[PDB]
Nucleic acid binder design. Structure first.
Ligand code: MN
Ligand code: MN
Ligand code: MN
Ligand code: MN
Lengths: 95, 105, 87, 94, 95, 103, 96, 78
DNA sequence: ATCACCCTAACCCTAACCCTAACCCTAACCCTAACCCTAACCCTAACCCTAACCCTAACCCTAACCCTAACCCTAACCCTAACCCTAACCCTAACCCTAACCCTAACCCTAACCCTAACCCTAACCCTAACCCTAACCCTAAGAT
DNA sequence: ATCTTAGGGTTAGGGTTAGGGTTAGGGTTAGGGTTAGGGTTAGGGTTAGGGTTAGGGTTAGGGTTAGGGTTAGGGTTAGGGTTAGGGTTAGGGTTAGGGTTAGGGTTAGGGTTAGGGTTAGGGTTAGGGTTAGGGTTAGGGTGAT
């Protein structure tokens, strides 16, 4: 049995060292068609159009988790909380 | 010499650059020197990126430059990182960095 | 030749393990329980904004198919310029 | 179909001059072409505005140069202006 | 000297139309002119790119339309598109 | 005038000249300057409305930049549209963080 | 004698409801000409060019003090510290 | 001249920013941040002045620099 | 502070897939000549910037005091990591078809070119109401009984 | 809360400036009419996205133990804050010079237009190497004795 934080630190090193997408492709494609179709019906997506979106989302989210962690560390915490995501988005001017 | 790129001593296409400037809706007229200077700047910067990326390809033990290499090269150069600061390299990944505060005692 | 399937609750497709992985690449040591629904909220807003603009481009082109370029053009507008999918 | 342009031919040339034993992936070249197009439009647009501000119809090497000076980091800009002035001078010679 | 343009004449007209008993300071008018020029460029530039993307040599009311849809807010774009379509229709009526 | 024909206060004539002069496209449609002048006039009207109301509130008759600032930052949509713009002499909106407020 | 944090809260209300510039014009104009000479010698400035810069600086700084305070409050503090200005600037993408 | 932007002038800017209490190290940090802001804007403004083949930095040159910096200013000409 | 076991890193090679060197043919850039409006020179107006003087007075700084917020340490809970296993559902290589895209031939009207014409808007002036500046005033909490 | 205390918005007075009503003519925009091509037509190829079948194994969902990080407390030090009084330096009030920006005219040449010419590079096919994925290899650092 590993101590709490060990597998966690190992995971950071694992995923930081790679490029593979981290969300599953079909669940993500469904979310895209859902959101899109519920703005304009009978839309088609080029396979790459969805991939371009997924790359964008994950790049966005990972960079947000960076600022989020900076905020949790700022408040002398180790664990990220909604108030950190919120402050990062506030300062980023996303509101 | 015969191509305009040959005359300016460039690998990048002076011919194309001139066409793209004219057909791009930037100004009524384009100077003879403008596509030459631009092709040169574009060629310089691609040489600068390819240099650092090829070096990172060589460390990761690879023969071929993949987007990871372009990402490591971009994000490890202060000036390329600034120039491409609001750009996303698809399949680039992140730079490895753990905050020292998180590291064990 | 006939009717498609209704699409609902697909934000739950962005699972807790998938959200953990994104936080690990972001270099996060520990994750609160409320983070998972919050990331879902933030991701939905991000996609709504991008897809809205992409679909506006598709529509202008008088097309039914959202292309990689439409997504690329949308991201540039959002100030999230993407390399690799054309342009 | 309809023909598609690319900086592929030149990126490969500039790669061989720099690292003659290194290759490039289909996607990595995709990123390189995306890079060339972005900076082309960043410089061309800035030069377009410069000529506009100064009530001039033409974009000259002078508009390209101050656009480079405005958009590039200090030392990249320093070398790009050198690289550029060199090309123009050589071109005016030939 | 040399001639200097302005939206001064129109801002005053539109003001006389909304607030017939309200005036405007030299600086406040400065801000109004700065505002008109910024949004003119924002829309004209977006429309310039739209025509370009779609390999079309002309900027039409359709390019202005979707630029407004891209640049304006959720409800302002709704009303601006209405006021725009209204003006064009009225113009097409009057030779 | 073309502005008269479209029922606008804003100049259709000028807008058309600024579009082709401005290096946006080889050609400009007959409807494009009309639609644009209309949008520009609508947004001018929207700002002047809220600002004039804020000027009315301050016991004032003339709109000053403060009024434009209060109008812009109090509207969610104008605040978004002019989110990366600074109104010279505008000031800030009054807002004290509740955490700072006394016991 | 007023309690600690009373004149301070009163000051926020004063300057928040005001628009006047808060830096003195001549000390500011000097800083501008100083920085400028380090860029190009024998430069002239239109009176308005300096005013445009001052308006820009103060607008920038006030908005930075807003994000800074948000950061101080985030860390359960009331008083702003360099680490708050730094975090505001990092997330704003001004800093690394 | 960087010391011309005094501790009281900096406190006033923090009050508009809605700050209740200010650390002693803030004053020298604001000074650092303000200098960077001006260096960046004036550099670009002077680049415009230079392109115009002018000696005098105009309001427009400052306006053009700010737009580039993504800090668009309303009321100085453009 | 010694030993156990889970891990990643890294060796082996077999494995496929993607790179890059080949082919060629299509299409863009290149050469040339006459084209013109831009931007180059030139002189020199009339603009506005800097330079130097004065008078306090609004404003900054040192050095009076004590409030209470920040920081450390501790010890309360309980949130959230790590591990196990079952079964969904994703990924995979297929299959197919038709809507959707877009080539490329035909056509016409929209858009630009030109000139001259009225007519709007800029630059200027001058008046006057809105706003500013000052002193006395009530409201309104502020800190201590 | 009830006691004195400050200060800031309130009322009213009457000064100063700059809003906005105004003048003229300059240059912008409009209605004339010709000219050319961009873009609207209908059509077919033809690509390709959506939907389907198929399977199996990764990856997920859910509950379980308990570490260990989060957040309450109290109790220490001192850092900024109020207030004060001396006093530097800022802000107008109001000069003159002259380098600067630049209107405007004369003229040359750089940048465009044109069609034929041909060379570069896009899209085609295809052989072999670099990378991938499955086999065990050892050391590596972890966390219990
Ligand atoms: Mn602990
Ligand atoms: Mn102290
Ligand atoms: Mn020539
Ligand atoms: Mn090819």
């Amino acid at each position: 049995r590993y101590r709490p934080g060990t597998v966690a630190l190992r995971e950071i090193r694992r995923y930081q060292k790679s490029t593979e997408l981290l969300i599953r492709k079909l669940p993500f494609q469904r979310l895209v068609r859902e959101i899109a179709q519920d703005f304009k019906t009978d839309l088609r997506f080029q396979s790459s159009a969805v991939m371009a979106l997924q790359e964008a989302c994950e790049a966005y989210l990972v960079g947000l988790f960076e600022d989020t962690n900076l905020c949790a560390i700022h408040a002398k915490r180790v664990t990220i909380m909604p108030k950190d995501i919120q402050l990062a988005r506030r300062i980023r001017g996303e509101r | 010499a015969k191509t305009r790129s040959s005359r300016a001593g460039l690998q990048f296409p002076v011919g194309r650059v001139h066409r793209l400037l004219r057909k791009g809706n930037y100004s009524e007229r384009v100077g003879a020197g403008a596509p030459v200077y631009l092709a040169a700047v574009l060629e310089y910067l691609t040489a600068e990126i390819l240099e650092l990326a090829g070096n990172a390809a060589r460390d990761n033990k690879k023969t071929r430059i993949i987007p990871r290499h372009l990402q490591l090269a971009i994000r490890n150069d202060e000036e390329l990182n600034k120039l491409l600061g609001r750009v996303t390299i698809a399949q680039g990944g992140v730079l490895p960095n753990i905050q020292a505060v998180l590291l064990p005692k | 030749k006939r009717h498609r399937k209704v699409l609902r609750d697909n934000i739950q497709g962005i699972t807790k393990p998938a959200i953990r992985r994104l936080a690990r690449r972001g270099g996060v040591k520990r994750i609160s329980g409320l983070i998972y629904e919050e990331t879902r909220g933030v991701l939905k807003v991000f996609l709504e904004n991008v897809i809205r603009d992409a679909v506006t481009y598709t529509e202008h082109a008088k097309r039914k198919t959202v292309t990689a370029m439409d997504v690329v053009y949308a991201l540039k507008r959002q100030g999230r310029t993407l390399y690799g999918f054309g342009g | 179909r309809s023909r598609k342009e690319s900086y592929s031919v030149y990126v490969y040339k500039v790669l061989k001059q720099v690292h003659p034993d290194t290759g490039i992936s289909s996607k990595a070249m995709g990123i390189m072409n995306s890079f060339v197009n972005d900076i082309f439009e960043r410089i061309a647009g800035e030069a377009s505005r410069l000529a506009h501000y100064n009530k001039r119809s033409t974009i000259t090497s002078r508009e390209i140069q101050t656009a480079v000076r405005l958009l590039l980091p200090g030392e990249l800009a320093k070398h790009a202006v050198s690289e550029g002035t060199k090309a123009v001078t050589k071109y005016t010679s030939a």
